């Protein structure tokens, strides 16, 4: 049994990370301007 509040907070940060990776790619990848 894994406490629900842990499941969310872990999947929560996990979303902020991958989405934050996207925002980084806006200043580095092909979506840049340099």
């Amino acid at each position: 049994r894994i406490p629900l509040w842990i499941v969310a907070t872990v999947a929560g940060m996990g979303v902020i990370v991958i989405v934050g990776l996207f925002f980084y790619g806006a200043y580095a990848g092909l979506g840049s301007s340099l």
Binding site: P3, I6, T9, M13
Partner: peptide
């Protein structure tokens, strides 16, 4: 170069100071 090491610790620190309280069971 990779200060993501910092954030990680300070990021999991938040849920930790209440997780330990879920262990010691009290005052939540």
């Amino acid at each position: 170069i990779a200060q993501l090491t910092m954030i990680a610790m300070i990021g999991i620190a938040g849920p930790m100071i209440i997780f330990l309280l879920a262990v010691r069971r009290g005052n939540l």
